Amino acid sequence: NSLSEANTKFMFDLFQQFRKSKENNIFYSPISITSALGMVLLGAKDNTAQQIKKVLHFNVHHQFQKLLTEFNKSTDAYELKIANKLFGEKTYLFLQEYLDAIKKFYQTSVESVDFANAPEESRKKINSWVESQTNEKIKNLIPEGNIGSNTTLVLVNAIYFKGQWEKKFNKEDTKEEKFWPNKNTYKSIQMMRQYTSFHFASLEDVQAKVLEIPYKGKDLSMIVLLPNEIDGLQKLEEKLTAEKLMEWTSLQNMRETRVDLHLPRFKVEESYDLKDTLRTMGMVDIFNGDADLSGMTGSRGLVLSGVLHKAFVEVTEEGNEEFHCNHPFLFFIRQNKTNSILFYGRFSSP
Numbered sequence: 001n002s003l004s005e006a007n008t009k010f011m012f013d014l015f016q017q018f019r020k021s022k023e024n025n026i027f028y029s030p031i032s033i034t035s036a037l038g039m040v041l042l043g044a045k046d047n048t049a050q051q052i053k054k055v056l057h058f059n060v061h062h063q064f065q066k067l068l069t070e071f072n073k074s075t076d077a078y079e080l081k082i083a084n085k086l087f088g089e090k091t092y093l094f095l096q097e098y099l100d101a102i103k104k105f106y107q108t109s110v111e112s113v114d115f116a117n118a119p120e121e122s123r124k125k126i127n128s129w130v131e132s133q134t135n136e137k138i139k140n141l142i143p144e145g146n147i148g149s150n151t152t153l154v155l156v157n158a159i160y161f162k163g164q165w166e167k168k169f170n171k172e173d174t175k176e177e178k179f180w181p182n183k184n185t186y187k188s189i190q191m192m193r194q195y196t197s198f199h200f201a202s203l204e205d206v207q208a209k210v211l212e213i214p215y216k217g218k219d220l221s222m223i224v225l226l227p228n229e230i231d232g233l234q235k236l237e238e239k240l241t242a243e244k245l246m247e248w249t250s251l252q253n254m255r256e257t258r259v260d261l262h263l264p265r266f267k268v269e270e271s272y273d274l275k276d277t278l279r280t281m282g283m284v285d286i287f288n289g290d291a292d293l294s295g296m297t298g299s300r301g302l303v304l305s306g307v308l309h310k311a312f313v314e315v316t317e318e319g320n321e322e323f324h325c326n327h328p329f330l331f332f333i334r335q336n337k338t339n340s341i342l343f344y345g346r347f348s349s350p
Contacts, residue, residue, distance in 0.1 A: 003064070004340035006057035007034045009242045011344055013055070017277050019237065027268035027345025029159045029311045031067070036084050036157040038064045039106040040286075040304065043098045043295030048285040055283045065105035067340060072107065077217035078163030083133035083141075084108050087126050087154045088302065089115040095298045110296070115151040123147045126156060134160040134312075141271070141308050152302055153293070157309040161333070161343065163215040163222070165319030167196050174265060174317060180327040181350040183230045189349070190265045191326070192317050198261065200321060201254040206236050210248055211261060211323045214336075222333040222343075223249045224263075230327040233346070237330065245341075249334070260322035267314040268345050274307045313343055 011030035018026045038061055041052045071080055086102075088094070090112045103109050111129075113122045123142050130141045138158040147154065169192045177191035201210040207228045214221035225240075225248075227233040247253055275287060285291050291303035313333070325347075332344035 001063055001338055003060070003067070004338050005242070005246075007031055007340060008245060009057045010034060010055070011341060012240070012242055013281055014274075014277075015237075015344070017281065018272075022270075024350050025268055025270065025345060025348055027270040027311045027313065027343070028272060028309060029157075029343050031340055031342035032082060032084060032157050032159045032311070033274070033309055035064050035068060035106060036155055036307070036309070039084070039086070039102045039108060040155060040293070042101050042105070043095075043293050043297075044286070045292050045294050048290070048292040051283040051285055055278065055281050061101070061105040065107070067335075067338065068105075068107060070335065070337070071342065075217070076164070077215050078161060078220060081134035081137065081158075081160040083130045083138065083156065083158040083160075085126075085129065085156050086110040086296075087113050087115075087122075087156060088296075089113065089152055091116065092152070092297050092302050094296050098296050115147070115154075116149060119147055119149040119151065122151075126154070130156060130158045134158055138310050138312050141310055147306075151305045153304045155304065155307040157307065158312075159310065160312045162314040162316065163220065163333070165317070166214040166216050166218065166221075167194065168319035169194055169263075169317030171317050177264070178326060179264060179349060180230050181348050185350075187349060192263050192265050193260070194263070195260040195322075196258070197256055198259045198323075199251050199254045200257040200259050200323070201248065202321075203248060206239055207232050208236050209323060210254065211259065212249075212251065212254065213261065213263070215333075216319055219337050220333065220335050222331060224323070224325070224329060224331040225249075226323060226325055226329040227327075233328050233330060237346070240330075246339075250339075258320040260320070262322065262324045262326065263315065264325055264347075264349075265315060265317065266347065266349065267312070268347070269312045270310070270345065272309040274309055275305075278307065311343065311345070313345075
């Protein structure tokens with residue numbers, strides 16, 4: 001929906017920042033994050049909530065719960081483990097009303113913890129919760145020293161996903177290969193090869209190609225963008241905007257063609273702390289003494305102190321023109337029903 005629209009723009013704003021810092025593989029769940037903030041936005045008021053809404057590009061929670069259920073609908077098409085919880089200092093008493101809305105709309109809830117007296121035993125609490133909440137895939141969302149004795153709030157947003165390809169991949173047709181991060185260096189990888197008909201689309205403007213590899217079911221397909229030349233993605237990123245996607249990755253402007261695809265057998269694990277980032281993005285109150293999270297406790301004084309996001313996707317085999325992914329390229333798994341990107345990264349595996 002227009003929601004997915006907002007979720008997309010944000011993702012790019014988010015993108016732009018990651019770009020400034022990370023020049024390797026950057027992967028993240030725009031949708032997981034967007035929601036993580038909608039849950040917090042619930043218990044936020046005034047100028048503190050205003051920052052969020054603009055940063056997020058804004059009824060609302062209604063669809064964020066609507067869309068969430070979907071991905072939460074256990075299915076064999078794929079498998080995702082979304083571990084999104086609020087961890088706060090015990091001493092803060094959260095209004096049940098708030099707990100109702102978030103549980104209801106985000107199928108998640110707060111969790112009082114002794115940040116003050118026991119900040120160490122506190123970390124583990126959250127870590128372990130994260131593992132078990134993601135089939136034990138995402139571990140130690142928080143490293144030692146990260147959480148301090150002076151922590152009020154801490155939004156956790158881990159997420160794991162591994163879908164099964166509509167058109168399976170022959171485990172026999174996968175051997176060693178050469179991946180070119182840059183043009184002067186390369187790293188060996190196990191590249192999967194698949195010849196068949198896909199929804200291809202050539203990109204003149206940016207000098208790149210757009211392939212769509214669906215998952216079992218056809219409502220959750222991952223789109224990939226492959227710059228023509230090894231280092232043809234920087235320019236790609238440079239011209240990639242919201243509107244760019246809504247059109248370039250829209251199957252409407254795509255054509256089902258016989259394509260010999262060459263996709264690598266990878267897995268991206270990118271951890272992030274969007275505190276400063278979100279700040280510069282325009283969300284600043286929340287992280288300082290001016291934070292108004294009255295909804296969460298009926299009073300003020302609670303201040304978001306860091307936000308942890310961690311995506312972990314795995315691409316496996318199990319489920320004219322070609323698509324050769326031996327060099328960098330950006331991709332993203334969307335939800336075709338409502339074109340809601342729930343994952344996005346750039347693969348350069350340097």
